[PDB]
DNA sequence: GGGTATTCGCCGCGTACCTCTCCTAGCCCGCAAGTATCCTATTCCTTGCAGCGGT
């Protein structure tokens, strides 16, 4: 397993992506109707900036991967997920939870 | 969502020794060597100007 992959908890083949310079993603994405990580094409990013040319940011490679990276809190999001995993589901979502939980211990 | 099947991709496949060969490709710029050419002489001829005996 990719440990980026699951600590960031975001598909490897969007990482991959994202990674050589073959899309967008967004960092915070507040105030407007983007959310946190959400995945843009070239030109998906080019008109939602043209919509939105506002401050939200949409970054391009290891920069991005960087800020999101360090712009996340570990053992709230620890608290937040076995919150979660307290129940619904223990059925896939269980082991998954599980390791994201183990991980980020 | 959720239990399930199917696919994709990574991981792995004996020890010790002996002999031999071969190990980047392509451009480029100075540079040595070799050469064809150009200026350098000699001999003949017919002019153009300065000295010069002569009166």
């Given at each position: 397993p990719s440990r980026i992959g699951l600590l960031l908890d975001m598909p490897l083949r969007d990482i991959?992506?994202?990674?050589?310079?073959?899309?967008y993603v967004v960092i915070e994405g507040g105030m407007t109707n983007l959310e946190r990580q959400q995945i843009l094409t070239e030109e998906q990013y080019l008109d939602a900036l043209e919509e939105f040319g506002d401050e939200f940011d949409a970054k391009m490679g290891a920069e991005a991967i960087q800020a999101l990276l360090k712009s996340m809190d570990l053992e709230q999001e620890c608290e937040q997920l076995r919150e979660e995993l307290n129940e619904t589901n223990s059925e896939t979502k269980r082991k998954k939870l599980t390791k994201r939980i183990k991980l980020l211990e």
């Open positions: 991959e992506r994202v990674l050589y310079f073959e899309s």
